[PDB]
Amino acid sequence: GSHMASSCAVQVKLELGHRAQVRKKPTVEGFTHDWMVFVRGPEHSNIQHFVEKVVFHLHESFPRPKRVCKDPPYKVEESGYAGFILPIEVYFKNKEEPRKVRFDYDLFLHLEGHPPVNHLRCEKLTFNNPTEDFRRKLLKA
């Protein structure tokens, strides 16, 4: 019963994106590419109002595959040579419905010496019958 019941739902949005550059000279580990993945808010709105911490599960080949970002812009800047499906989990700060999301995002790259990669994605979060304080956070972002 979509909007058939008297329920007040708030809807937020998160952005999964990444830019992938190659280097004309690979790094010390001989990695050719440097990519920066990020999770952002709706239209560049700061999401730290409902977003607590975020995590990027990189490939085990990467030093510290688990990148949690509690600081400013949720982004990981790492170097590699090959792309892969990178599961991103976004943590929220609340005591209600599950405060973690799981977005499967493909980290793709170009050949060394080819057009870079700039892919943005926007995912909606929908919360049925949330607490007003939580709405206040979802609105303030």
Binding site: Y81, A82, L109
Partner: peptide
């Protein structure tokens, strides 16, 4: 397809 190399998380799973 036709892009940079790929190291999948699970080989043919």
């Amino acid at each position: 397809g036709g892009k940079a190399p790929r190291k999948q998380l699970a080989t043919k799973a």
